[PDB]
Paper text:
To stabilize the 310 helix and thus favor the pentamer, we replaced the two glycines in the TVGG motif with alanine and proline. Next, we surmised that the Met66 gate must constitute part of the activation barrier for coil-to-helix switching. Thus, a constitutively open gate ([name]) should also favor pentamers, and indeed the CA-[name] mutant also assembled into T = 1 particles, as did the CA-[name] [name] [name] triple mutant. We solved the cryo-EM structures of these T = 1 capsids to 2.2 Å (CA-[name] [name]), 3.1 Å (CA-[name]), and 2.4 Å (CA-[name] [name] [name]). These confirmed that the mutant pentamers have the same structure as the WT pentamer, with the switch in the 310 helix configuration and the gate in the open configuration. In accordance with our prediction, the CA-[name], CA-[name] [name] and CA-[name] [name] [name] T = 1 particles were not stabilized by the FG peptide.
Author numbering:
A (entry chain A), B (entry chain A), C (entry chain A), D (entry chain A): 1 to 221
Amino acid sequence: PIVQNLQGQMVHQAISPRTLNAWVKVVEEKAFSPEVIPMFSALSEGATPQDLNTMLNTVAPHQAAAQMLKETINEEAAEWDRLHPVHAGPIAPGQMREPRGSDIAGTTSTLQEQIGWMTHNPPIPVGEIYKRWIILGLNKIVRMYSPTSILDIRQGPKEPFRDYVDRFYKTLRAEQASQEVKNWMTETLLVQNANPDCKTILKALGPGATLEEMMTACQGV
Amino acid sequence: PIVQNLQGQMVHQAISPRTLNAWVKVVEEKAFSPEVIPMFSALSEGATPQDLNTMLNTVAPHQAAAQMLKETINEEAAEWDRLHPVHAGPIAPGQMREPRGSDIAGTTSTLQEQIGWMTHNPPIPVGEIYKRWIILGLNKIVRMYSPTSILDIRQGPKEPFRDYVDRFYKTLRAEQASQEVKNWMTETLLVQNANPDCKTILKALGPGATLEEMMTACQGV
Amino acid sequence: PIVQNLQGQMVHQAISPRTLNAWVKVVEEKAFSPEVIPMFSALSEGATPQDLNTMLNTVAPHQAAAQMLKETINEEAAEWDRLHPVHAGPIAPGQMREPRGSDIAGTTSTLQEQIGWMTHNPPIPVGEIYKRWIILGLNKIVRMYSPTSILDIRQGPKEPFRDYVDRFYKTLRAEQASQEVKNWMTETLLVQNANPDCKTILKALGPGATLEEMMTACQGV
Amino acid sequence: PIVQNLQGQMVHQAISPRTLNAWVKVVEEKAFSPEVIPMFSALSEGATPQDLNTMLNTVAPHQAAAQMLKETINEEAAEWDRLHPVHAGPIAPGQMREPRGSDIAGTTSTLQEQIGWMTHNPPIPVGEIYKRWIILGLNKIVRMYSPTSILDIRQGPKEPFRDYVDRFYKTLRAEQASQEVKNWMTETLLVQNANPDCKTILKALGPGATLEEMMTACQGV
């Protein structure tokens, strides 16, 4: 992250060891479940690209996930270079150069370059964009490691309706289908895969019932 | 939150990553049980409206809960605008403008505006009011996700009386009935739904016994 | 339909009784299955709006279907009037007036008006548009009478793969989901609901296999 | 088709609605069995390319079959263009232009163009060639939908020999192997897959027996 020194100048502060250890616990203990992404986003809050690569070292022992992340990051860097062609010409002395795809990812840049790029009015946030690339890679990894299809999430004969709903929506978060397909899933498949008593009540409830009304009508069933 | 710099001026400090990760763990692991509210209140202690929106991003993947929160917040902002009509007229240069409903929630304001509004003598606490709106939304969410009715909390044949009492009062906290209805519940339904031996003792104890006396008379039963 | 007399002038010829009887057999014997629509389109080939109302009388004894058709036709006529506002002003003597929604459906027009409107260079086809409105109504009717969800079409343990595919695609034709949802259905649900041996082969076949390759690999399984 | 008016001039007559309905019944009821091809050839007798596209609309709801037909037709149109290069140069006023692949299929042409092309001495039959392309596509479709291999057609213990022969030759018609392979099949596989009593008689009958002699010697067996 970025901190101000006693003289009012922006200084890079490394991630503290217990934050890094929290991220290591997330990576090594949670099997890339969907909650790895909110936790990563919280733990890399306000980070520089050099900090993000420190957090990416924890993924390297997981070769398939690390390779998927590398492919996503290379694709994003190439796309960034294509959409930001390197202008050839003079530059104002008070203006800094334009980082490349290998620079936003911190492969060839240095710490002061990233601090200066991020600390500006108006800012060009290099940490947030690299973070979004990482999150796309992690979404792909969560999709790859998902153990069940949404078609296989079915309410047990004695399972409470809220628990089935939580499992259903967690798998839906993992699968990341298209928006229209997701709407069809939540409207139709949730009712279709409920157990007989809840299914009877939900069918009687009619189409277009909100999830809150469905939870109300199935509370003790 | 708000901190003082070396020059004695109020400065906004972001929520630390492990605090945000604690909130993420609460959201993703506790299924919106009633204790989510004390934990949220502790974790957002002394926060600005911009910090509260960072904590609200964690809820967004939970669509029903996020929508219920959005509806509660929109209702509260509209009510605030109605009860605080925008006065048209001159304002003192030493006095700041009046934030709107979309400003207390931090949708259109900026960080310095919120810092200045909160840091004043006397203060107009924008963090506390937005926090109370969030807590109303969360109370509704806890009500929606509650798995059992208070009518279905019944002491097991071998369950200790203190454990049944704890389950009963936790469900009562979740359900949030009216105050008179809650008093009727704790006075009548708790005794009605106890197991036969404890029920015999409590009936012999008479009406208007305090909960402490009931716990005393049922300790090993 | 429209025929030329011996003098070269366009003349309306009524639908022959055995064509009408074929349509009656379709309506009264097929329970509004999806093939009612291709058959109706073939049997009303080149018809005038007055002929289409003769074919619509056969549906009138089926009150729910007839009412759904009437609602669809009224909606389409209102939309046509809205998108074709009645211009107030002079009209060329060699140009005919503009039919209204109640005129394209033949409620207030006469036979010669429809013949003249359809027989023109360039033509304004009143039969085709009314026919498309009828087809929208019939699609809704086929959806209403569909006995099974697409989620309930599952290959039998000894059912040949081609027969399961035919049932699946016929139900898909009946249900008329969105295009993206239909693509998801044919790509995912067809494989998910196959029987174990065909499912093993199709999973080994990999994603993005064409339906022809799936039929080839499952022929005798 | 093409008809002569009262003045002796060739006029296009549309396909009658009950002919189109017969074709619709063939498409929607017979599951693309091998007899769909003789029926299609009979029902499109003397048709123009514009009529053939009307009959092709009935196949469009069957997406796999429709796509296979479209691929076959595109391939044939490209081959026709390659073998009939568009000559650049003057043309006789009494001679019509040369239709392209998109014109014989009626995508860009008009009705009078096709009537003039077909009605000529000597004729250039555009209906017959497009019909042969359609028939190639339909042969591929019949192959795709075939439920059984020729290797799986085996005489039942009590099945009459003529019925087994009919099933065998119908599957052989569906499969459309090479001519030499088909000759090997009818000479060897038919005898190999017969039931024991008929097999004994056919082996005693010797190689090179005609099918009539085999039917004679197995009549009541």
